[PDB]
Design a protein around this ligand. Structure first.
Ligand SMILES: [Ca+2]
Lengths: 58, 224
């Protein structure tokens, strides 16, 4: 239900390729995305389980 | 690497990759047992791969060596990215051959206009997101600090410099981080960050390796 769950996934300015999870409100599920390694927003989780616990149902 | 080309197969023996279940960053072999990378590429456990051209097709020249020590610069700032540099000590010395060998540390700072070689397995943006199996290369000039600060008002610290093209279209990108910017055979830069990849007026920002030669030498010596 938090609004940050509705924000698009944020890769950020750093240039690593790190697998993370974000909640996709259109999908109603968490999906993977590329995280650059710095400046993460809140719709950014290390597991789908963690992702759904915080953002599921948003 | 965006808007570059496939590196000659044998040609960059100093280019390594950092792995933790998958390829997540690059690095540069600066001595038989030491690798330079970016601090934001830090992970608790890392396996370094050496001698790769195609990360999915082994040709027999590849080495797989665990990181024994992983040391971020003590002044690394995870918010501003100041001092984005890291040293890795391999658990055993790399076997040196044509496909695996060292690159020189810089003996003078980057000079504006100098043409450098940036490399890595980063996103190419060639068909939307495209993470290539084959190592990619980019020829790109060191930009002036003025150009760098004009591109990134507020963000360019003393540890940083820009290499690339103000017109956009050619740049380093995600998965390239920690990898080399080599100018005339010397490691002048570490791939660090940027606003997007290959955007107009937003060239890649790189860690100025020359500023850390003493720290590198001291760190290596302290961990013999
Ligand atoms: Ca290979």
């Amino acid at each position: 239900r938090p609004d940050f769950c509705l924000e698009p996934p944020y890769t950020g300015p750093c240039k690593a390729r790190i697998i993370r999870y974000f909640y996709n409100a259109k999908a109603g599920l968490c999906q993977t995305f590329v995280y650059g390694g710095c400046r993460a927003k809140r719709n950014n989780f290390k597991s789908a389980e963690d992702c759904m616990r915080t953002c599921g149902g948003a | 690497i965006v808007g570059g080309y496939t590196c000659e197969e044998n040609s960059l023996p100093y280019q390594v990759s950092l792995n933790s279940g998958y390829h997540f960053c690059g690095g540069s072999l600066i001595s038989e047992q030491w690798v330079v990378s970016a601090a934001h590429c830090y992970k608790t456990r890392i396996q370094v791969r050496l001698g790769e051209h195609n990360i999915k097709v082994l040709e027999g020249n590849e080495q797989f060596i665990n990181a024994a020590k992983i040391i971020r610069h003590p002044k690394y700032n995870r918010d501003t990215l100041d001092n984005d540099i890291m040293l890795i000590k391999l658990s055993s010395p790399a076997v040196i051959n044509a496909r695996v060998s060292t690159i020189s540390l810089p003996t003078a700072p980057p000079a504006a206009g100098t043409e450098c070689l940036i490399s890595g397995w980063g996103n190419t943006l060639s068909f939307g997101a495209d993470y290539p199996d084959e190592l990619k290369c980019l020829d790109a000039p060191v930009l002036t600090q003025a150009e760098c600060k004009a591109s990134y008002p507020g963000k360019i610290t003393n540890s940083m410099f820009c290499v690339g093209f103000l017109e956009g279209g050619k740049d380093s990108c995600q998965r390239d981080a920690g990898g080399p910017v080599v100018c005339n055979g010397q490691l002048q830069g570490v791939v660090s960050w940027g606003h997007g990849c290959a955007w107009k007026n937003r060239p890649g920002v790189y860690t100025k390796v020359y500023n850390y030669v003493d720290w590198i030498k001291d760190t290596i010596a302290a961990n013999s």
